[PDB]
Amino acid sequence: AQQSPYSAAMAEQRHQEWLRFVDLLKNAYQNDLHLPLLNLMLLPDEREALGTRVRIVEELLRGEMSQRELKNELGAGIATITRGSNYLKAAPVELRQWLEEVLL
Amino acid sequence: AQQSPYSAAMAEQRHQEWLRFVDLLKNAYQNDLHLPLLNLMLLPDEREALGTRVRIVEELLRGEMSQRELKNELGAGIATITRGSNYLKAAPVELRQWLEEVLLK
Numbered sequence: 064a065q066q067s068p069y070s071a072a073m074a075e076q077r078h079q080e081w082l083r084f085v086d087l088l089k090n091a092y093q094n095d096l097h098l099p100l101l102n103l104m105l106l107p108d109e110r111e112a113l114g115t116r117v118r119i120v121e122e123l124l125r126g127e128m129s130q131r132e133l134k135n136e137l138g139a140g141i142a143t144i145t146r147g148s149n150y151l152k153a154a155p156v157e158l159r160q161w162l163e164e165v166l167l
Numbered sequence: 168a169q170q171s172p173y174s175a176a177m178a179e180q181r182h183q184e185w186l187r188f189v190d191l192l193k194n195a196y197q198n199d200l201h202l203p204l205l206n207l208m209l210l211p212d213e214r215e216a217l218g219t220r221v222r223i224v225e226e227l228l229r230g231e232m233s234q235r236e237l238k239n240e241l242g243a244g245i246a247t248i249t250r251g252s253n254y255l256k257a258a259p260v261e262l263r264q265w266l267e268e269v270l271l272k
């Protein structure tokens with residue numbers, strides 16, 4: 064369905080709400096309140112997922128671990144690897160270049 | 168030790184992994200790469216949840232929105248309100264007071 068004014072209005076509000084979170088967390092990092100903020104805003108399993116996703120991204124970029132090793136060690140099965148690979152390919156070049164510098 | 172070795176070894180790995188994420192995002196903000204990093208690391212529905220949780224926290228601290236309005240505007244039923252309230256109570260007071268300054272003007 065082509066976006067309607069109702070759906071566009073809701074999407075823009077969600078976008079602004081997201082940016083407000085992003086800026087709140089930016090500020091928290093500047094005031095050394097990011098750790099308690101992240102504990103408030105994210106559940107323990109969500110925090111764990113983020114930690115694991117960094118490893119999945121790292122290992123996809125490194126290219127050394129096999130699919131079976133990614134599944135065993137990171138819990139990342141074939142569909143998770145496909146999605147993570149897609150996210151990497153869709154990322155802007157500046158992000159991919161930086162991730163290569165910092166994670167490898 | 169608080170935990171047996173198996174559990175402790177898993178917790179230590181998860182802790183390291185969490186700090187790696189925290190540091191990665193810290194540096195992404197400094198490099199203006201936070202938006203694409205968070206798009207990579209979080210699904211659209213997870214990003215939406217975070218945006219909505221900020222509003223729930225804000226409205227809990229503000230005290231003006233009713234229970235019905237929290238549900239109808241922010242999707243937060245009775246149990247969600249209780250959880251969010253509990254998280255706020257457990258947070259350091261320094262964080263709660265900062266959130267009041269920065270979310271409530």
Ligand SMILES: O=C(O)Cc1c[nH]c2ccccc12
Pocket residue numbers: 116119120143146147150207208209210
């Ligand atoms: O697709 C998912 O299940 C969640 C997800 C979000 N960002 C990711 C990066 C790498 C691997 C998985 C994810």
Ligand SMILES: O=C(O)Cc1c[nH]c2ccccc12
Pocket residue numbers: 103104105106220223224247250251254
């Ligand atoms: O408990 C939840 O459903 C998720 C959650 C994490 N932090 C929150 C802050 C306010 C409202 C909900 C949450």
